[PDB]
Amino acid sequence: GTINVLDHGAKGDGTSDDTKAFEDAWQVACKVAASTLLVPSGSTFLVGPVSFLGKECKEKIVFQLEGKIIAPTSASAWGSGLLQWIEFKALQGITIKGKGIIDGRGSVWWNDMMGTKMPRTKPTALRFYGSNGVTVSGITIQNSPQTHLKFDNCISIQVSDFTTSSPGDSPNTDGIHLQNSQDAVIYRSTLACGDDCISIQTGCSNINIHDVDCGPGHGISIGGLGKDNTKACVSNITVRDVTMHETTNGVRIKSWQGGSGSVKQVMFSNIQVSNVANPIIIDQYYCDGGGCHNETSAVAVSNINYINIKGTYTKEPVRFACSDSLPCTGISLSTIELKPATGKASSLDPFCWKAHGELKTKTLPPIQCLKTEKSPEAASRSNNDACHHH
């Protein structure tokens, strides 16, 4: 009963455009609950921008990716907008699974070889929008133009046995990006990236990441939150049993001066860092790609917990750089064993600026700069949070 794309006009030769064939197979699957669309092992499919749209589609469809999907490598063959690659939208209980590969052939973008002036933000390889019950398992996304996998306005997400592979020096190739999404578990995954391995943006809550290896890349980050004086709301984030190998950061929270809202109830636990520049970082002066001035509003950071984080570092081992007008509160550290990878790093002390919290154990290196007193300043800004849904 499986709907093989080769039975719907796909050539599977890696040179003929099979987009229409994939759209036609999708229309077949869309009408049948629990149907399976197979992209078969042993074949490679050139597929351009495509949206598997599904408000009228039935539930529990399986998109079984066992072969390889490759992106076009010219502006003409891409087509209009350059605004997306593969999208699934407005689906219920959709699953993408299999041991196949999505290859964005992203070097044509990274090297400015597309035959057109490129957009600042290049297409995400695989994006889910507006869907309830999303499973991504098994597949590998390699050489994405920019972001590998994105969830936007999705609820009830499971990502497992999943791999990204883009070069560590490829520009902006973050692994998994979540925005306005809730109730997600990401596990048993391997993320080699040129940017954040996972980044969690505004609107996210109840995100659980465990049994993940990150590297190369920039670590696991919340943010950058609040850019362009916007409200950001993030809560209930857990990261457990993760390794970061030669990444620029370990676990990071980044927010922009002038943002509002809050990030609260975050747990970073059982983290191993190897040769990581900045293992632990909260940065409320983040401004990569923008202006680096201060403002009187901040995203309120509170109730951030670090437990059992160990390994080696090359820059400041710990940096809590919080807003002058809204100090971070409720930072807690336990069982921190960070050792300098070099003689130079051994002279770099923890840095705390406007950061309140507690040490539950002695730490290596000692963190002497967290303030134990409460912050009336932080509390006085509470009306700027207004993340009521969190």
Ligand X SMILES: *[C@@H]1O[C@H](CO)[C@@H](O[C@@H]2O[C@H](CO)[C@@H](O[C@@H]3O[C@H](CO[C@H]4O[C@H](CO[C@H]5O[C@H](CO)[C@@H](O)[C@H](O)[C@@H]5O)[C@@H](O)[C@H](O[C@H]5O[C@H](CO)[C@@H](O)[C@H](O)[C@@H]5O)[C@@H]4O)[C@@H](O)[C@H](O[C@H]4O[C@H](CO)[C@@H](O)[C@H](O)[C@@H]4O)[C@@H]3O)[C@H](O)[C@H]2NC(C)=O)[C@H](O)[C@H]1NC(C)=O
Name which position in 95, 165, 205, 297 contacts ligand NAG (CB under 6 A).
205
3 state DSSP class of 202: coil
The reply to whether 285 sits near ligand X by the rule CB under 6 A is yes
The reply to whether 301 sits near ligand X by the rule CB under 6 A is no
Nearer to ligand NAG, 258 or 330 (CB): 330
Whether residue 125 contacts residue 92, with contact meaning beta carbons closer than 8 Å, is answered with: no
The upper half-sphere exposure of residue 380, i.e. CA atoms within 13 Å in the direction of its Cβ, equals 10
Nearer to ligand NAG, 148 or 264 (CB): 264
CB 322, min distance to ligand NAG, A: 21
3 state DSSP class of 70: strand
> What are the tokens at 189?
């995954």
Alpha carbons 126 and 102: distance in angstroms, whole number: 8
The reply to whether 235 sits near ligand NAG by the rule CB under 6 A is yes
Instruction: Produce one character per residue of 311-349: b if its CB has 16 or more CB atoms within 10 Å, e if not.
Output: bbbbbbbbbbbbbebbbbbbbebbbbebebbeeebeebe
Nearer to ligand X, 105 or 315 (CB): 315
**Which has the closest alpha carbon to 195: 162, 151, 243, 148?**
148
Written as one string, the DSSP assignment of 210-234 is: EEEEE-SS--EEEEEESTTT-EEEE
Active site residue 388: no
> What are the tokens at 35?
């149907």
Stretch that binds ligand X, among 160-168, 178-186, 221-229, 346-354 (CB under 6 A): 346-354
Dihedral pair phi/psi, residue 60, rounded to 5°: 70, 25
**Which has the closest alpha carbon to 151: 200, 188, 195?**
200
The reply to whether 206 sits near ligand NAG by the rule CB under 6 A is yes
Name which position in 351, 359, 360, 377 contacts ligand X (CB under 6 A).
351
The reply to whether 359 sits near ligand X by the rule CB under 6 A is no
Whether residue 232 contacts residue 255, with contact meaning beta carbons closer than 8 Å, is answered with: yes
CB 265, min distance to ligand NAG, A: 6
The reply to whether 262 sits near ligand NAG by the rule CB under 6 A is no
Catalytic member of 218, 356, 385, 390: 218
CB 182, min distance to ligand NAG, A: 8
Active site residue 13: no
The reply to whether 243 sits near ligand NAG by the rule CB under 6 A is no
Sign of CA dihedral 75, 80, 81, 87: negative
CB 186, min distance to ligand NAG, A: 17
Nearer to ligand X, 39 or 277 (CB): 277
Alpha carbons 299 and 78: distance in angstroms, whole number: 38
> What are the tokens at 250?
């370990």
Choose among ligand NAG, ligand X, none what residue 2 binds, the Cβ cut-off being 5 to 8 Å by kind.
none
Q: Could you tell me the end-to-end alpha-carbon distance of the chain, in angstroms, rounded to an integer? A: 43
Region for residue 223 given its phi and psi (left: phi exceeds 0; alpha: psi -120 to 50; beta: otherwise): left
Alpha carbons 24 and 4: distance in angstroms, whole number: 11
Stretch that binds ligand X, among 73-81, 124-132, 351-359, 382-390 (CB under 6 A): 351-359
Name which position in 24, 161, 213, 324 contacts ligand X (CB under 6 A).
324
Alpha carbons 83 and 345: distance in angstroms, whole number: 42
CB 294, min distance to ligand X, A: 4
3 state DSSP class of 53: strand
Name which position in 236, 274, 332, 334 contacts ligand NAG (CB under 6 A).
236
CB 199, min distance to ligand NAG, A: 19
CB 348, min distance to ligand X, A: 5
Choose among ligand NAG, ligand X, none what residue 265 binds, the Cβ cut-off being 5 to 8 Å by kind.
ligand NAG
Stretch that binds ligand X, among 67-75, 178-186, 204-212, 341-349 (CB under 6 A): 341-349
The reply to whether 349 sits near ligand X by the rule CB under 6 A is yes
Alpha carbons 157 and 131: distance in angstroms, whole number: 9
The reply to whether 321 sits near ligand X by the rule CB under 6 A is yes
Q: What is the contact surface with ligand NAG in residues (CB under 6 A)?
A: 205-206, 235-236, 265, 390
Catalytic (active-site) positions: 195, 218
Q: What is the contact surface with ligand X in residues (CB under 6 A)?
A: 285, 293-294, 321, 324, 347-349, 351-353, 368-369
